[PDB]
Amino acid sequence: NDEREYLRHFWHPVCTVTELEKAHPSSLGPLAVKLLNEQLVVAKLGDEYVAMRDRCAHRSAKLSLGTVSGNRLQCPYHGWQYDTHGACQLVPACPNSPIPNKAKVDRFDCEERYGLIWIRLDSSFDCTEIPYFSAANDPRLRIVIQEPYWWDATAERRWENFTDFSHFAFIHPGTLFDPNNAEPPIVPMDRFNGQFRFVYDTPIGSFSYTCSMPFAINLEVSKYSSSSLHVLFNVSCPVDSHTTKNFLIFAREQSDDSDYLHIAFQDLVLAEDKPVIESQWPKDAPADEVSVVADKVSIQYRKWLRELKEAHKEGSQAFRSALLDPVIESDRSY
Amino acid sequence: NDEREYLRHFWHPVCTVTELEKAHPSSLGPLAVKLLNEQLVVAKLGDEYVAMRDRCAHRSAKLSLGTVSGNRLQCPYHGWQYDTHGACQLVPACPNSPIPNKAKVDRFDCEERYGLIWIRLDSSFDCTEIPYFSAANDPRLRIVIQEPYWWDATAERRWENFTDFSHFAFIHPGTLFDPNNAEPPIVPMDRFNGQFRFVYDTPIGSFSYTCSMPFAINLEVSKYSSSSLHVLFNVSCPVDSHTTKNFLIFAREQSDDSDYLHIAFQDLVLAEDKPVIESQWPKDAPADEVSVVADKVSIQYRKWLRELKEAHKEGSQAFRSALLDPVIESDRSY
Amino acid sequence: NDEREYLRHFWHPVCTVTELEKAHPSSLGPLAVKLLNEQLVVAKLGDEYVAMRDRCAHRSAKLSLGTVSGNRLQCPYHGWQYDTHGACQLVPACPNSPIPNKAKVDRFDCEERYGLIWIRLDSSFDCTEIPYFSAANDPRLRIVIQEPYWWDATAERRWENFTDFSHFAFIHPGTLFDPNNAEPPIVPMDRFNGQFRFVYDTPPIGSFSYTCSMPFAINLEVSKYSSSSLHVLFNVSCPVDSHTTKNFLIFAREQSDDSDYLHIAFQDLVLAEDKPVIESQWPKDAPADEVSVVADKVSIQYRKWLRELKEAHKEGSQAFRSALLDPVIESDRSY
Amino acid sequence: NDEREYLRHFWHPVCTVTELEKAHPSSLGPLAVKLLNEQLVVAKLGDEYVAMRDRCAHRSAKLSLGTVSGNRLQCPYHGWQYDTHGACQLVPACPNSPIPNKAKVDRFDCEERYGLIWIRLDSSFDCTEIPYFSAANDPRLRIVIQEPYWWDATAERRWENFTDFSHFAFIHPGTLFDPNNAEPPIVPMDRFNGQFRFVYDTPIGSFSYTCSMPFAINLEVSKYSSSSLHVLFNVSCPVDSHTTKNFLIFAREQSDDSDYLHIAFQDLVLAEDKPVIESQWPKDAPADEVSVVADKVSIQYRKWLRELKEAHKEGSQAFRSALLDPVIESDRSY
Amino acid sequence: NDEREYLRHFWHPVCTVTELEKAHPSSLGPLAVKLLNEQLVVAKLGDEYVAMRDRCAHRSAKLSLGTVSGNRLQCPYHGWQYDTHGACQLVPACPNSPIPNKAKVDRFDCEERYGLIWIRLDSSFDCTEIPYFSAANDPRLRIVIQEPYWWDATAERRWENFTDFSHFAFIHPGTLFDPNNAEPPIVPMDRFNGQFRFVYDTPPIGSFSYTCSMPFAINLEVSKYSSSSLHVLFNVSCPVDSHTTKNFLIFAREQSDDSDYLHIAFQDLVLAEDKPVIESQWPKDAPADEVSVVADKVSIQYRKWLRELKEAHKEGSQAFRSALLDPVIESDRSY
Amino acid sequence: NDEREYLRHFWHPVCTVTELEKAHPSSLGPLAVKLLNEQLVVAKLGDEYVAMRDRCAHRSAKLSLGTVSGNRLQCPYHGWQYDTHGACQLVPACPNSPIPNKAKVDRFDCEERYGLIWIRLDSSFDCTEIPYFSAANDPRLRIVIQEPYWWDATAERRWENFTDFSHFAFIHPGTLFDPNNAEPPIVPMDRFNGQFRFVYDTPIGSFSYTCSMPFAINLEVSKYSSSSLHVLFNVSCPVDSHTTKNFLIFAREQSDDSDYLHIAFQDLVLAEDKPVIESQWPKDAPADEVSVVADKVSIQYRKWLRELKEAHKEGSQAFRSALLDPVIESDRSY
Ligand SMILES: Cn1c(=O)c2c(ncn2C)n(C)c1=O
Ligand code: FES
Ligand code: FES
Ligand code: FES
Ligand code: FES
Ligand code: FES
Ligand code: FES
Ligand SMILES: [Fe+3]
Numbered sequence A, B, D, F: 001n002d003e004r005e006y007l008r009h010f011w012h013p014v015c016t017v018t019e020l021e022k023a024h025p026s027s028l029g030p031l032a033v034k035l036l037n038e039q040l041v042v043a044k045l046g047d048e049y050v051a052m053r054d055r056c057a058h059r060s061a062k063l064s065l066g067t068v069s070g071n072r073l074q075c076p077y078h079g080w081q082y083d084t085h086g087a088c089q090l091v092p093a094c095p096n097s098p099i100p101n102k103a104k105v106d107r108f109d110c111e112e113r114y115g116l117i118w119i120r121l122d123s124s125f126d127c128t129e130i131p132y133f134s135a136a137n138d139p140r141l142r143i144v145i146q147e148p149y150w151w152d153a154t155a156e157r158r159w160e161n162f163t164d165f166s167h168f169a170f171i172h173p174g175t176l177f178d179p180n181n182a183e184p185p186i187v188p189m190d191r192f193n194g195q196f197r198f199v200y201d202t203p204i205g206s207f208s209y210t211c212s213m214p215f216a217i218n219l220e221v222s223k224y225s226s227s228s229l230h231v232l233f234n235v236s237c238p239v240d241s242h243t244t245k246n247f248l249i250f251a252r253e254q255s256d257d258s259d260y261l262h263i264a265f266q267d268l269v270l271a272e273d274k275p276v277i278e279s280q281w282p283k284d285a286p287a288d289e290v291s292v293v294a295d296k297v298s299i300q301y302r303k304w305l306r307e308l309k310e311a312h313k314e315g316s317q318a319f320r321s322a323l324l325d326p327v328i329e330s331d332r333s334y
Numbered sequence C, E: 001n002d003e004r005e006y007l008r009h010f011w012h013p014v015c016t017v018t019e020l021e022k023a024h025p026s027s028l029g030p031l032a033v034k035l036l037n038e039q040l041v042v043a044k045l046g047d048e049y050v051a052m053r054d055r056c057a058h059r060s061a062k063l064s065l066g067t068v069s070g071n072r073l074q075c076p077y078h079g080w081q082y083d084t085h086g087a088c089q090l091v092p093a094c095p096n097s098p099i100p101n102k103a104k105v106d107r108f109d110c111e112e113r114y115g116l117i118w119i120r121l122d123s124s125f126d127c128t129e130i131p132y133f134s135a136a137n138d139p140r141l142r143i144v145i146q147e148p149y150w151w152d153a154t155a156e157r158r159w160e161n162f163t164d165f166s167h168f169a170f171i172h173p174g175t176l177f178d179p180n181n182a183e184p185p186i187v188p189m190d191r192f193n194g195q196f197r198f199v200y201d202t203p204p205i206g207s208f209s210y211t212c213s214m215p216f217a218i219n220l221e222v223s224k225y226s227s228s229s230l231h232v233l234f235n236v237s238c239p240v241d242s243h244t245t246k247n248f249l250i251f252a253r254e255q256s257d258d259s260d261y262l263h264i265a266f267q268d269l270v271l272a273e274d275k276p277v278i279e280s281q282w283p284k285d286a287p288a289d290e291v292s293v294v295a296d297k298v299s300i301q302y303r304k305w306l307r308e309l310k311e312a313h314k315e316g317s318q319a320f321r322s323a324l325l326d327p328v329i330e331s332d333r334s335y
């Protein structure tokens, strides 16, 4: 409870734009979402995506059962109308009386990017950004947004699953395992602008990771001397202490083939991981877990996370340094 | 539960007579019911309706899985027989041994009225009565008891919903909303014999409310110089901290039409209310809720409940004064 | 709560051998089980039945989703292999590096007996044994292991239901109730070798002899003289958590030319009659306000003994062993 | 269907008044019903209960999905309005054009009696009446209408089951079987005004049957020198070749007890019969069935049905004689 | 019955391209479909969409449970491989023996157009084409293919529902009904190139222009002048069997900066309003006793033309082609 | 319909003995079964297994809802009692009157063998036997009876699936396919005593088939010079024209391992075959199916079946010759 609080300073995806537009016949929302156990409502007021606590100030009805009416969100119960800043500007029963000062609900940072809606619950440290998706605005690439998949596992466990290759022989023997390259060498890892960066070579191929902390992964797969660029972007929304809503976007240079060739393969990979990751208990990794040399990526990830957690208690400047100070191990220049 | 102890002193409805008769083929019960989170069992023993704790004194089996045999409720496990006062009168395994003095279960006030079964858990203040239903013993009126309806909402929030008119335009636009009277004014409210009394007029008819504290509403709808008296009697059973079992009885002078004309309209109104009331959270009204002048009825209701809660803690005489002292705002003379 | 602590010192059944062999196509397990709210995994590793915590030391995946390979249990995630002592012997990703010292999981005493798998979670007092079943190794008897049955009731309440007959007229009027024998009298009860022993004679030429291995096992021998028709029932509850039991019934009979299903149907009917009443008892553990009568002697004596065991366990190994194994005889019988 | 044409001349119950009122929020219907495999729609238009074919004349939509508006049944597709005689009186698309003469649907006799809706599909023989229920207009008796019960069995097999006593020891050992009277003797049976009449005595009471052909049974149970008259009225609606919708009405002098005491006992009796009657196959009694002397009631029933079937084919006068000619076996004088 | 026979001569849609690619992880199919009670399989074999009878010639297994291998459809049972003409080219069990002459399955004309797969079961008259969709290859329009919807109603009854407006006040009172325009008058109807053409003007400055490719396809263009807000709806029913249609809706719009889901929700609501009424019509095919009024001209003309086609088909190829393609003009318009 | 009639002359399994004993608490049945679209009832009367048409002669109730009472099967409706020959010997309602000659139901050959109940519907040709299971009464072998498995496929199609190896590469690539012996040679097949016999060698191993016509297969798998005998016995009950209830028995010499090792493997094999065989249509193999040289077994099977079918029309002696005349292709001596 105390230990998840620093996660409120990051931007997290809560839904696709498609899900918001399908939520209500108007295509404007409202849509109820949950983030870090907070009940929120998302709507499009004018040209602005807005996110508020899903709870009217008057008698606590859920705004997510209400209606968007121009530049206002209208509560279903007695019709109070809230503006983009969460302040009531119309009490229909008392339309000439002054509106109480307390007639306001909490409003949160809310922004569309890459076809997802992102929410940042706490902006007080002013140093976090929506994660990096390298394929955005690259006209060589066809971009496809998959439907979200829900797992009974935490965002940390899902991240460590995504960036590990030790498990291919046992979970993915027919899909991702390469029998002639069964053990990946330890690779150098760099911290730069709040991202982990690391690259694996075959050099016939290349797996280039840019991971915006804490839960987003951008993987570029290129074949050298060939035009086979494939990008996977995966980000987990920490819905509550046990549950993730996960988003996978993929982009590809060679787009003459079917989208569903890649979707079916990706779904097979996910279905192989899913029961094993859901079995991990307790849901958060305890201090007694035993690491080996091949676990470099997750060891370093856990190391960074607890630095961020300690820096959050020390305040805005400690946190900004912990997040954004470079730490270079490789030969690359940034 | 500390905060709802004072509710144990009121009469609460727990089932209809029909539900009790239908529970078991005997037609005498037993029927399990829950009131203020207490598990009770109701039965008809001889000519009397009885309510007991649903827990055998011997080995704690549910008496509600037992059998009514004349004027005994027989436990299903070892067949101990309990009389109308909750005292065991037969131990079948030791039929000539004396029955231990501890072989009794708590027995509560239990009375039929208007075709409902009513239970008062604590009679020690001796100053509460079954709520007032004005159509009873009026031979001009046909009386119908609807089937009970369960809501995931508290009795307080249900009462506030029933007595509010600000919500009609938004929840009931095509059923109850009157655009010829879109904002009923604030009215005088009287306290008299433990009831709230208040009337709303046309601007030719009237809505006359007699509300027996804490959870019953008697509403007489008249149209002037017509034989068109309609009466709605609604009462919420506070089952536990998040649930109500609700009862609606209605009476009408004009009785040549179908009962189901009124039931289907009343059910449609209830269905419009239900999702919004059940969305309200937290279940009990917290202090941060924001009232406006049009909430007079709700504000005064919350105030009286607070007074009853405080007076209960001060004892029998304080509670009795808080409940039955008259407080008149209108020009009426009772 | 902490009042269950002393129960970890006994052997409890967790599954049938059949359940273990059906769990996984290899017929070696693994199988997940739960005992006193502990999540365990059972597998057949070589010629041994082994019980471990169902949690890999590396990244906490469930070993019960993995595979037996040779004499080892292999985790489904990164393939660490654990031996019969719970120690990791292979890290596939680092096959030449040294295996970390803490690469191990807790292991528990585990044994097959009578076609059930038994686990003891705490062996430090070392004074308890697997319950007694009188029919094993008796070639006159056909033995049948029933499918386990799950009840939303504690093991103590289940034991008291099995040993009571006050309830026959009301729960079993058409199955077990005998109208010409409605009141079995109170009988002497012996403590011996950590068992309750007590015998009901028929005055109708028979006998019901109970040997109840504390805390949750019951061996009932029925003799219908003067006939060669011995019938043995063996019932034991696994305390799965604070609310739930997984129950095992094994029955044996001398006259075994009739159908097994004649007996299984009858027993299943008896169990179905008991089930809703026992599951309705609340709260789940019997509080101090229950009102006993003279006919409840067996139940009263059972609760007194569990209370002694629970108090002796707080005073340590030697006190517990005396409470469990000291004899207390009140019948006229030899031992 | 060739063999059941003669049944169209009788009055058959299709629903209770309650079912009709509950079908749609209007309380006026429409309700879809099926009789002798004909799809019909029932509605209350003005003061009249009407039955029509459930098939609009225009484009064959189901009128049962439409709306009752006063004294019109409105088709849901293009809104044609049908009056109480089945004639279209408004074509909304051509409101001043004349309505084609073919714009009518077949309309059938439809009458309320005893709280049931009754339909006679063919009135051309003008010699059949709604079955006799002896307790109607007896002010000493409380009358209760049970909910209808559907069986996968024909109306003939249901009737034979209700009037047989040979089965009590085997289907009803603990409910109806009397070991003090284990084999009721064969009795005289009378034909009178289209009814079978027969009485069984004690060896102090009597079972007096008045059976209006073909599917109704009126059973008066008396105990001598007591005010204990019980009446059961049972009638099967022949829905199609393998299904009945059955109606049970019961009346009683002693009315201080619960209606549900009797309903639950009557429902238990029905539940004992149901699986055996539904197992009978083929659904219609073939010629190879083997009767014994104790089947007198069933044998004479089958004979009268055969005569009615033959007489129908010979025409109105033959059918009327076959139905209403008296055939007396008893010493009674009607 | 045999009254459906003439329908085999037209092109009918059977699935979306999306449905075909999702069917099997290879994204090449195969996918089982049903058209006029024929069980077919569709697969992408090389650069061609191919339709065959979904029944192997060897032992009658369903090819739709098999696999595309190269440019061939391989049966799941014994692995016979069929080419784009339905001829077996490999018998894995007898790889050197000659392949039996009758080792082949029926194949059918199959083409992609507008993102749907179309099949013609009988090509012997060779005079029908794939229906016309006015929005294809118009770069001013955003085109959206909806998910197919299944109704328990025939394709003829579905077509008459789509082209009627008599029903708006009663089925669509809050969606399509216009209170200031409740009675669209009767309009002239043209037959041209096997299409019905007819146009409704607004006296409210608009236009509804129908091009209906017989028998079951409807292209509706809506112009809301004087604005650049052209909207095109294209609806076509697949007659799956005597009782059932699988329906495809494609819509196109010029103003495409709003959400696709604004339009999809509205259209889905319209369809949900129609569905129970249309499915309630009985019997499934309209009998001779239905009573028409003057407002039903479109429906009356539609049924007359289908009757001609059905009669011309019994007289052969040349008669059918004239019935389908002869012009019959009653408007004042150019063609 | 006409074409399945010759199948009534063979013995077919309808249930396990276990299923019969579990059907009713008595362990004696009755159990309803279906064979070649006939509704039958099976019960144990004394020491005899009996099979009758599931239809009482009196009023056609199902005897399978009745009760075994010593040496009688008692109908649930009016309690008629049938003896082991299907003749009613007690009419409870008329216990002294002569029982009608027609009071009899059809009785069929019924016999236990190998833990299954077999029924022969037509014994008129007197030349068929219960199929051969080679492991019965071999004390070296542990015998296990699996639970029956139901397929939506005919008995002929299931038989041809069981005796074919062409399909291993495609249906069983991981279970039964042997990559170094991918094409089995054509083998000689012998007809002897109504069995097909044929043997496949590896000679390190051996698959020896004895197939009692028409639906039973006995497969002995032995490794030469080793004691690895494994027997599979599979027989299909032709329940109706589209459905089989299939029985698998297996026996093994090495029985120190778990029964469920073999059961799990066998279930995996069956689950691989099942969707492909259920897809075959039409359900019976038409004349247009195209065979290749590798289909010898099924070609010869289809050849024998149509010989039996033609011989059935020519009568008892033609059929006996067609079934039991030897036709030897191999070197073996019988
Ligand atoms: C040939 N064969 C087998 O060899 C086999 C089997 N099931 C298990 N085995 C081992 N089946 C169904 C089978 O047809
Ligand atoms: S609760 Fe939102 S306006 Fe009243
Ligand atoms: S628990 Fe009620 S009598 Fe024993
Ligand atoms: S979690 Fe078990 S090997 Fe990694
Ligand atoms: S179908 Fe009834 S009005 Fe058209
Ligand atoms: S059925 Fe297709 S290859 Fe045999
Ligand atoms: S139907 Fe079987 S005894 Fe009457
Ligand atoms: Fe993975």
Ligand SMILES: [Fe+3]
Residues within 6 Å of the ligand: B161, B167, B171, B172, B269, B273
């Ligand atoms: Fe309301």
Ligand SMILES: [Fe+3]
Residues within 6 Å of the ligand: D161, D167, D171, D172, D269, D273
């Ligand atoms: Fe009966």
Ligand SMILES: [Fe+3]
Residues within 6 Å of the ligand: F161, F167, F171, F172, F269, F273
């Ligand atoms: Fe196979």
